[PDB]
């Protein structure tokens, strides 16, 4: 707490610098938002299978989106990028990362170990080794400290909402992690307790309900349409008692802004 403010300021600076190109999918001739949704949903399952941190997942997605912001990738190679990204995120973030052979295993042997290792190098080169990216998760944990009082259901629900945002590059690619975290926190808080984006955070972040509105409207719709989405791995994950079964909670019908 002698560094809370310093750290939050710094992450706000870095999230702008670590932000992927908003319009990259339109510059990708062979891949689409739909295929990316499939990839990210798959990484959620990988994260579940190997009991990886949520932060690891958020990191891998940042790496993928940044990589694809400058590198054209054929549909047959998109999973390879994702696998290499997940390996890198695991090495960065995890106490006990899965072995390389385990990442080769979950690609259903489509790619070899050598390809995974070569893609690891390429991803590193393309990102110029800059892997310490701020994530929605990093902002959420800080925002959680402003609860009155702390609520396990609010925390897991916010995490669930922030995770849903990873799936859909349209629209979430246009919003910064600190904004998605703010929208996720408000919407979680409202769904569980009826309460709202609190004043202590308006003042910490400079974000008002109004500045959060555009992301919050999108996240609201995403939350309402969640049972109908083609990708379901995040909903299935957040049924677990580990996350207090928060994906079983009913989304509020209106937000009243």
């Amino acid at each position: 707490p002698d560094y809370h403010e310093d750290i939050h300021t710094y992450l706000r600076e870095m999230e702008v610098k670590c932000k992927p190109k908003v319009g990259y999918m339109k510059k990708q001739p062979d891949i689409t938002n739909s295929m990316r949704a499939i990839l990210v949903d798959w990484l959620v399952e990988v994260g579940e299978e190997y009991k990886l941190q949520n932060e690891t997942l958020h990191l891998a997605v940042n790496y993928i989106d940044r990589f694809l912001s400058s590198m054209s990738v054929l549909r047959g190679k998109l999973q390879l990028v994702g696998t290499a990204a997940m390996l890198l995120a695991s090495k960065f973030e995890e106490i006990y990362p899965p072995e390389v052979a385990e990442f080769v295993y979950i690609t259903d042997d489509t790619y070899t170990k050598k390809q995974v290792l070569r893609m690891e190098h390429l991803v590193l080169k393309v990102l110029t080794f800059d892997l310490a990216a701020p994530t929605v998760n990093q902002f959420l944990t800080q925002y959680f400290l402003h609860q009155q009082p702390a609520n396990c259901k609010v925390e897991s629900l916010a995490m669930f909402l922030g995770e849903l945002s990873l799936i859909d590059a349209d629209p979430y690619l246009k919003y910064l992690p600190s904004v998605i975290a703010g929208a996720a926190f408000h919407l979680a808080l409202y769904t569980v307790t009826g309460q709202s984006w609190p004043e202590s955070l308006i003042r910490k972040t400079g974000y008002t309900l109004e500045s959060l509105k555009p992301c919050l409207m999108d996240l609201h719709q995403t939350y309402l349409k969640a049972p109908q989405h083609a990708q379901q791995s995040i909903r299935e994950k957040y049924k677990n008692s580990k996350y207090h079964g928060v994906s079983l909670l009913n989304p509020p019908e209106t937000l009243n802004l």
């Binding site: 002698d2 560094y3 106490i95 390389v100 995974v116 690891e120 800059d130």
Partner: protein
């Protein structure tokens, strides 16, 4: 980017947390550099290298070693650093008993605290602060180096890797198995290093975790709930721990003045919450007359 063609290796300096460190010379600019060589024929790029490179690229501060370039790949990865003079361990090994004056010590501690405050403000734990990982130049500067064991932390922290920190410099919250440790572990290490520069011997030179703990207890007193609330509930606490009375700091570090003793005590507080931050320490009265003395040339 960066090319190995332009560097001429001079000598092997030694081995860090990972990789091998060489002294070399840029043939075109004349700059003397350190090269940290990592062999990639061992599982892809090591997590230690990934973390050090990523974090050092972010950390630009006068008291943190300057990462200049990364040359990749040829089955080898080379980190290129500015070359200073010598690490603090070698300096101390090369120093006569009277060779490290208190004003130099004060200056070195002040700068290490600046470097550490900068790490912590940028959500980096170093987790291996010991004399060998600290570098001096001939002009009075000292810098944090070897971020191979470092990590980017969150607010608030999660559980990270248990041990962590070379034993002599390891914080009691790590030894006692606390689920959470944070920036205070780096401050403990610096407190140990401060005492070591002053007395010219390691403060707590244990050979096992229990030996390490008992050494700490004999100096600082065996911790109880009054001194460190929660201590008796920690995973590796034992009701059977021997009881030792806290020592007088005038006897722990005889050459040290009142202000110096005060700062040391605040850096070695049992409770990581009460333990002084690097940022708050910079304004301690010990540093009122701080300057920047030069070291001997060895």
């Amino acid at each position: 980017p960066g090319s190995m063609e332009n560097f001429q290796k001079v000598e092997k300096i030694g081995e860090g947390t990972y990789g091998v460190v060489y002294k070399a010379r840029n043939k075109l600019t004349g700059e003397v550099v350190a090269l940290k060589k990592i062999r990639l024929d061992t599982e892809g790029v090591p997590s230690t290298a990934i973390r050090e490179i990523s974090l050092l690229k972010e950390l630009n501060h006068p008291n943190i070693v300057k990462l200049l370039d990364v040359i990749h790949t040829e089955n080898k990865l080379y980190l290129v650093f500015e070359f200073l003079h010598q690490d603090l361990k070698k300096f101390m090994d090369a120093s006569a008993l009277t060779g490290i004056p208190l004003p130099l010590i004060k200056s070195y501690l002040f700068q290490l605290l600046q470097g550490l405050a900068f790490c912590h403000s940028h959500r980096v734990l170093h987790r291996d602060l010991k004399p060998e990982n600290l570098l001096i130049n001939t002009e009075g500067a000292i810098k944090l180096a070897d971020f191979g064991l470092a990590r980017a932390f969150g607010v608030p922290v999660r559980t990270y890797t248990h041990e962590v920190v070379t034993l002599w410099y390891r914080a009691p919250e790590i030894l006692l198995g606390c689920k959470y440790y944070s920036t205070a572990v780096d401050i403990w290490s610096l407190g140990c290093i401060f005492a070591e520069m002053v007395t010219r011997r390691a403060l707590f030179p244990g050979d096992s975790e229990i030996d390490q703990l008992f050494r700490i207890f004999r100096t600082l007193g065996t911790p109880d709930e009054v001194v460190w609330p929660g201590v008796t509930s920690m995973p590796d606490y034992k009701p059977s721990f021997p009881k030792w009375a806290r020592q007088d700091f005038s006897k722990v570090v005889p050459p040290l003045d009142e202000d110096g003793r005060s700062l040391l005590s605040q850096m070695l507080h049992y409770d990581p919450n009460k333990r002084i931050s690097a940022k708050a320490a910079l304004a301690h009265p010990f540093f009122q007359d701080v300057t920047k003395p030069v070291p001997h040339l060895r």
